[PDB]
Each structure stands twice: as C-alpha cells, then as structure tokens.
Nucleic acid binder design. Sequence first.
RNA 1: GGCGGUUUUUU
Lengths: 248, 149, 60, 258, 78, 115, 31, 146, 99
Amino acid sequence: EGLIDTAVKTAETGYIQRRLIKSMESVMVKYDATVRNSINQVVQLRYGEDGLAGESVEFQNLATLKPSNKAFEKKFRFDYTNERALRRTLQEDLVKDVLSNAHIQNELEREFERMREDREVLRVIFPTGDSKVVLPCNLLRMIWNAQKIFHINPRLPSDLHPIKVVEGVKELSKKLVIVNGDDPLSRQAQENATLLFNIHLRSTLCSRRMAEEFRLSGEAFDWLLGEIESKFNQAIAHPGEMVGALAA
Amino acid sequence: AGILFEDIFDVKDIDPEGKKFDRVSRLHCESESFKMDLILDVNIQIYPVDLGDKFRLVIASTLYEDGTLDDGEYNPTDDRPSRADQFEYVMYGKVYRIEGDETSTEAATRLSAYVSYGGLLMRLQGDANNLHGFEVDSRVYLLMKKLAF
Amino acid sequence: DDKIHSRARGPIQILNRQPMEGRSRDGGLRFGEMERDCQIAHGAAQFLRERLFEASDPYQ
Amino acid sequence: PYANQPTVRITELTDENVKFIIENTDLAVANSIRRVFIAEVPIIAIDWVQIDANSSVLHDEFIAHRLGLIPLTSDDIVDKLQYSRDCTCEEFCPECSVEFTLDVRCNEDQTRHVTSRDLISNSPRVIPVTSRQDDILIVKLRKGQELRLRAYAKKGFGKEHAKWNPTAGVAFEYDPDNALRHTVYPKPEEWPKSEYSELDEDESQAPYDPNGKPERFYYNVESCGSLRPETIVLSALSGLKKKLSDLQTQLSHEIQSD
Amino acid sequence: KRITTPYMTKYERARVLGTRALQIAMCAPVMVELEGETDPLLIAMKELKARKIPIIIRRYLPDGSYEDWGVDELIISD
Amino acid sequence: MNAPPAFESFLLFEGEKKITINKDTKVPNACLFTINKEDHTLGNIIKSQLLKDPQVLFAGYKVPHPLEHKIIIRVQTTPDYSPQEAFTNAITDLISELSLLEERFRVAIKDKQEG
Amino acid sequence: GATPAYGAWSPSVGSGMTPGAAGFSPSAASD
Amino acid sequence: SKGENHLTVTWKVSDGIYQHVDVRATLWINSEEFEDLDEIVARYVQPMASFARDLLNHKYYQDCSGGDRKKLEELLIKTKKEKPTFIPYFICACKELPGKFLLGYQPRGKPRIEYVTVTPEGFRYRGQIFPTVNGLFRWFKDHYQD
Amino acid sequence: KFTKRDVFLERGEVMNLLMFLSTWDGKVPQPAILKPRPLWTGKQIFSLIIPGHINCIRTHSTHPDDEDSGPYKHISPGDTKVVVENGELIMGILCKKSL
RNA sequence: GGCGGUUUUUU
Ligand SMILES: [Zn+2]
C-alpha cells in the first residue's frame, strides 16, 4: 500500500506543479515596487502585501497582544511618579527632569495612548489572539546583541531619557519607507503597509521596557536603531524577482 | 587581591534528582560562615568527592597574587607565582547570570551567581553583600581544595 | 564507468539541430522544463538563454 | 625534551609468527610500527607476467592475478635488489629482479593441478614458499589445454599493492584491562577477558588510572611465508628509520635554502 | 524626480559585474589601479567596490518610462 | 578509467618538493610544515614527539584530503625556540629511539634463539 | 600602472576646534 | 610603458624628489605637440617644475631626510615646550608623495600635518589655485589662523 | 555526543581537532580544568566553531517541559536549554533543534 | 552520421 501511494503521489504532483508554474511563470516584481504579470496587470500593489522578500523574515511575538488591561497598563505606561523607581532606573540628572518638565509627561501620555490604539488595532486585526507573527527584523535578538556588545550590565542606572527613545522611534518610523511620496494617498499606503512592523517596533522599544528590562545606553540605542533600519532596507524586495515561479 | 569570593563548604547531597551523566554530578553544598548554597558540577572521575566532605572554594578573577588581570589564554610556560599551587581542583569559567530579588523601590537583598566552566555549571546563592565582585560577562576561576579536618 | 559521460559540442541531430541523446551516441543532458522553471526562479535569464540557445542550437 | 628508552621482550618465537612486547614507548610510535609492518615492508613478488599460450578455462588476467598473490621468499634478496623504478638499465635486469618460467600441458587423462611448484625460478633462493604443506594452486588444466608464461618479480611494499604485504595478520593490543578507559563498556561483565589480562576472574576490568599513559604494547606478527616474522620487524624498523632520515635531510636542505 | 529604490538589486549587480568582466576581457581600460591580479571578474568586482564602473543602468518601469541610475550614484547592497 | 596509479602515493613527481615551510602571521613562532607523498605513519609519530618536547606550545598534523597525498604539521614553540629546530630535534631523537629499539629487539631475538 | 594620478587627487582638509585667543605674530606686506 | 601612444615625462620636483607625468600624473595639452614635442615641456612640465623648485629660493625650505613625517612631528612636539614664543614653521618635500609639499606648523596644541599641491597655473592650497608662487606663501601667513 | 557535559579532551586531542578549523585565530583556549590535569570540554572546543558574536537560545529534544516553571531554570540538570552568548556555547547539548 | 517502436533497469 505504501509503495502504491508513493507512485500515485509522484504521478499527480508532477502535473500539479507544472500547472502551478505555467500559471505564474511571468509574474515578477517591477521597479515600481509592485507585482505584475506579462500584461502589466497589477496583482499586488506591494509584494506579499508588504513589499518585503520572504528570505529575511523570522518568527516573533507581539508583546502588546493578548495582555490583561491592567498588566498592559502597568507594563507600558512608564510611571513618572514613583521617584524611587525613577532613581533606580534612570539617573539623578534625569529623574528631576522627568519630574519637573511636564512636556515630557504629556509626550509619554500621548505615547501610551498610541500604544493602546495599536493594541486595539492588533486585537481587531488578529482575532483569536495569536502572538506568533512573521516580521523582518528580530528586535529581541538585536537588543540582545547590542547588550552583549556594549556591556550594558542590567543593574546600574542607565542614561537614556524616554524623550530620546520616543524621538528615535519616531525618526526611525519616518525613515523606513516603502511607498515613496508626500501625496496623501502615498502616505496612507506607506502607513498601511508598515503598520504591523511599526506596531511591533513600538511595542518592543518602550520607555518603561527600555528602562526596566533592557537598560540600554544612548550609544547602544543608537546602534540598535541603525541596525534595525539597515536590516529592514536589506529585506526590501529586489525588483525583477520572479515571485511567481518562487510561489509556484 | 582579586579574590571575588572565598569560603569553606561542606557536601550534603549529590545528584538529588539521580545522576544524569557518568563523570559529572551536582554538589549541593552549604557554607559555614556566610550561609550560602552551592550547586557545583565537578568531574567526579578525576576528582572524586563523597558526602560530608569539606573543601575551600575560592572564586578568583586571576591566579596571580599581584593581580595583573591576564588576557586569558593557555600559557603553561609561565614561572610566575600562581594561587593554584595550593588547590587540588581548578576550573576556568565565565559567570553568565546573576539573579536577584530586586523590586521597583528597594534594592536586592539576595543574589545567585550562575557560572559555567565550559560546560560545568555552578550556582552560588547567598546574600547580596558578599557577591559584589561577580559581574555578568566576566572570566573567573574555581580553585577548590579538600580539607582533611 | 558505464554511467560517466561528458560533452563539448558533440554530434547533432538532423531534424532539430540540437545535441544527440544517450551516452552511447555521445549526447548531451536534457535541460528540462523543470530546470527552466528553476532558472526562472533564480532570475538568471542570461544563463537561461545560454542554455536554451547558445549551448543548444544557435541559428540565424 | 628528548625521546625515550624503549625496551623489548619476546614471548614466543616461531617460524610462522612472533609475539613480543614493547615497553616505555608511545602509542603513536607503536601504531606507526604496526602500519609499517602491514605496508612499507620491502618484499619480492611477481609483478610482470608474459603469457605466450593460455588455453585454460580461466581468464588471461586471472593467471597473472594468482601469480602475483603467490608469495616468494626474500630473506636476503630484498635488501640487495633495488626498485625496478630506480633501476639504471632497461629490461628487467637480474640485479633488480628475479625471473620465473611456467610451461605446463595436460597430456594424460586426469586433470592437472598447475601449482606454484611449476614456477621454475632462475635464482636459487628466490622461490615460492615450497621449501619446508601443499603448494599454491594456480589453475586446473584438462587434457588438451596448456599454459606457458614467464614472469619477473620485483621489490615492493604493501603501500603499492597487497601482493607485497608480508604480514598476514598483525594483532596489536595495548592496555588489556580497560584501565585508561579508552573503550567504555556499557556492561563490562558481558565482555570476555583479554588473553593478556592480569586481572582476576572476579573484577570485570581494572579500575581507573587518571595519571596513566598507554604503555606495554603487545604485538603478534604473523608472516605469510615470504619473510620471517623477526625479519619483518627488523625490516620495518629499518624502513621507518630511513623515512625519518630522508625527511630530516630534506628539512635541512629546505632550512639552508631559506 | 526618480522614484525607484536607491539600492542595487542583486540581479543588476550580477549583470553589471559580468558585463564589466567581459569588457575587461576584451582589452578595455580599467578604472582602478590593479594591485596584481589578472582575472577580469575580480577586476570588475574591485571596480565595483571602488565605485568606478563606467555604466549606468536603465531601469524600465511598467508604464514605459525609464530611470537611469549610475553605479556611483545609487548605493550598493553588497 | 580515472583510477590513479599506485606509485603516486609515495613517489615524488618532477617539481614537487618533499617538505615546505610556511611561517604564519596570526601568532608568533608558528610554522606549518607541508610534507608531500606521506601518510599518517610519518606524521602521528612526529606529532607525539613534538608534544613530548615541553618548549613546544602547539603541535598537530592533518591530512587535507585522503585522496591527496599530503600532510600539514603546525608547530608553535616558545619565542626563544624556533619550530624548525623543534622539528629537527624531534626527528633526530625519534630516529635515535628507533635505532635503540631495533638494537634491543635484535639482541632480544638473538637471546631468545637458544639463550 | 606604477605611475598613476598625483595632482588630480582632491586635497582633503582636516577639521578641528580650538577656542584660543589672538596672540600670534602680525602680517607682512606684499611689496 | 603602461600603454601606447601616450608619453611619459620625468622631471625634478626639488632636491631629491622627482615626479613622472603621463600626457593625454595626468597632464592635458594640445594636439600640436606631435609636430614639436618640445612644447609639452617648454609650456607645461618645465614651468611647473620651476614653480615647484622656487621653494629652494627661500631659506625656510629643507630636506628633513626626504620629508620624514616622524622627524617633523617630534620636532614640532618638542619645540612647543622648548621655545613656545618662537615656534618655527617648515616647508619640505616628501619622497613618498610626489607633486606635494609638506607645510609643517602648529595650528594648536596638537600634532597635525598639511600639504600643498603644485599646478600648471601655479600652486593649490585649501582648494584655491594661485597664479604666482609667492602669493600663496604670503596668503598663508595671513589665513593660517583659521 | 561531543557537546555533552561529560566530554573531556587532552591537549593532544584538542590540538589535533584544532587543526581542522579554517577560522581558528591561532590561540589555544584556556582549559575548563587546569588542575589536576589540563582537560578541555566538548562545548568549549565547539565554541570556537561559532563565528562572530552570535546569541541564541534553543531547547534540547529531551528537555522536560516542567523545568522552566520549577527551579533550575537557568541551570538544567539534564544539560538542556542551549544558551550561546558572544558566540560561545555555555549550556545545553546540540541536536537538530539547534543545528 | 542512420531512423521509429517496444521492453527492461536505475534515482
Ligand atoms: Zn636492472
């Protein structure tokens, strides 16, 4: 029985694969960053609904997904009121700043509102609560490499102001582009394409997390941002790739 | 000096969960002064040990008395003094974890240093006072000699 | 020894001026449609054309 | 920072095999001497056959193969003859080769057994193992068949071909009682005791010895018939020494040129 | 007003290396000092690293337009 | 059809050198000796002899490929001791040891033969 | 070749900082 | 000897330091040189070499053993403490960098080296070409305070 | 079997294995057991094979799931939980899950 | 300078 099954499988899968390849042997990514067939008919505005190659993608987890409201609040809020904990994490030249300056407090409140919004988006997007998702850069491994390189020593108070992390993440999101163009439609498409990745990036690099679990320094965080942007640009799909034959 | 730690320990239990390998076993030892737990993995073959045995364990950052901080490389052709001359079992590892009971307000009061001697693991749990010379990512030595008492 | 075979512009057929077939007739290996699809996936159009034209049956 | 002082003790000396023990040596040197016994050992053997008429039933190359496998004594001829490759003449000169002739023909009704005895050698000492036990059967001929050929045997070693392999079966054993633990027995009680095991019948294997080096290498060299066993040992030691001497000379020239 | 990606795709890089190696094999003036090599492919790779290949790539778009990039203008991947 | 002959495992070819020396640049006092047309017989013993020598920090032989008749012996001694002389002394002491062993074996055999 | 460009090389200028005071020698006339 | 057609002219940059120039080291000229090859020198190479050698007319020029950077560096870092009020400057020629001249001085309390290039029109310093040879040296003494 | 915790090598074996390493820096690592005799470890020798400063964690096949919850999380009795840091094997045995 | 078919084998 096993031998007969193997023979029929080898006889049918051959014709199946032949048809699958002849159906899409012409599809390819054009220089306009869009998948089209031989008739220039758009099949995907962006390859894989993202515009990224399937080689530089690894499995990761969405930290802000399936949390308990209270757990999420206490973990992604960065309390700027517990002066004892603020001294324990940051340095004295930053605790007084985060206490006095109210602009920083408003910025962190706005960041938490944006974090809550992204969590709701993930919940309405990924029903059933599935944290395992494929994304380009493995931010956890990158943070680990940065720690092991710069010798962070998670124990001493780090020197990284939350405003610095917030502005760095914002600048990094502005840099990573897929749909080049200041047009309203261009910006809308760019945001919709890199939505999940930016959500995951923000969820990983958070003020409270970066100040509690990672303890990265300024130079370490700068190197982390550089590495992330470089890896994302490298994972960008190369125009002129027979995505059709690859999928077949 | 470089003596990151030095203390006498006594053996009280070996491989409580059954001996897994054939040349290595767990040494659940307890201090005598500092009151500290020790979960060391030694080579039972070349350096056999039984229950009730006491050994003077000295975790150091270098084997030289003057303390020159060696770069870290196998150089047997060395006539310099060595602290290993009065120890029977020496191993070179790198502390890979330092857990502690920290909180969000008051500092930690109890630490636990996990070091790996190229395969053999040793956990040294105790107070957060005598474990100041232990830092993550750092080479250390074991240096243990059995006491005749 | 009964299976080893090579080629470097050996004999050509009469109908379609392409290499022969078979080790005895001193023929070349067949570049199957599956190999064509593999090369397409790689994206080596130059190599693909060289295999299906240059080292197959050049003609004007 | 120098070599060691090895000792030797023979336990059995016979005309077919020799058992000895080498003490105060290294495992690498012991294994090297063993491999030299098995391969690099000069010895004579048929190598260049010329058949003029073979009406036997076997093949024409079958005869040459069998003639090459037939041994030939070379107790005091291999040290005198030179390699035909390094010869300074043309054609197999008697100074670097021995000649053999075979001319048989089955006339009677009974089948013939062309054995090694038919190999009439031109030299007196270089002859197949038939001095002092039947002979090596080459082929069988029936009435009306024949075989005429002449062969030349040269000097060679096992590294070239198995015909120049004098040592039939070299048995080499070190540390009978698994003391150094070079072999871990999952169940020592299930393994027998070695022939040279000094351990009693109660204990399965000797205990562990950390500061223990491999010593006391027992060899049992069994000669095929060409060279005597002690002769094989001496020739192997001489060959290994010559290889080391040539390597040292080449190294000195290379150092001087640089 | 060029909108194509500023990186060199692997296909373009491989084709440019092969073409430059062929031009070099046909006896052509190099654009870099040779340290002591004779393989035209290696010379083309060195020229790419030095950013001196006298070639501009004409990338066509689906509409029909085309953008001309320069090996020394766009960033190289590898 | 492509089987190599049987003499290319020991006989030297016109142009090939028996032994070649190459100084390494990664660490001081390190030399690799490439020997052509040899096997483990003429390599394991030299490695063991070099190990016995205390001034040799490192000594190990390898075969780049079984089909290829060639070995590489990397040696590294103290800065006040060169690998060339290390190799020379190793081979010399090994030759002396083999000669002594041969003499002892010969006398043992001549004694065993009715003595 | 072993005789490449020399004058075509772009003379790179170095940068630096030195909040120093003015206390050097004056200037001379061109005559 | 590198290729064909073109020609190489070797001239003296100063006392010891020479320089080669290949004509299309790249030196551009007119096409009439084929009739009187004397012009490539009588109008470019010789005037450029004379401009380069004009430094010999000033006593502030020296050899420094073929323009040893280490010698100038040690001298400059020693004189800073031997005679702070009399810090000298030097102009030398390098043997490992034809067509250039090392102008050694102390911009600040740190070591640094600077070079000046010669051109057909004259010299080149800080990216500006000068038609004369003395104009650049007179402009340096005034604009070296940057 | 080479990356197990009970794997010890002598200087001779270590220096012989180092011969087959095309990316060896040329320096011999400090043995995991200096006295009473220099004994390297299988994991210590394999660390030199990992290029660069790679960081990763993996689980071994015969890894009991009821271990991370209880104690001995970062110190597995069965030598599981491969934790490579700075391109150096520390804990755990290699298998298909890691290679 | 040579063809079509069938069969048998191998991954
Ligand atoms: Zn002869």
